Amino acid sequence: IXGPVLGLVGSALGGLLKKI
Known part of the structure; x- marks a missing residue:
C-alpha cells in the first residue's frame, strides 16, 4: 500500500537478483 517503499524493495x- 506504500509506493516509495516498493521502489526501494x-x-x-533486483539488486541481488541481477548481481553476479
Whole structure:
C-alpha cells in the first residue's frame, strides 16, 4: 500500500537478483 517503499524493495530485490 506504500509506493516509495516498493521502489526501494524492487531496488534491493533486483539488486541481488541481477548481481553476479
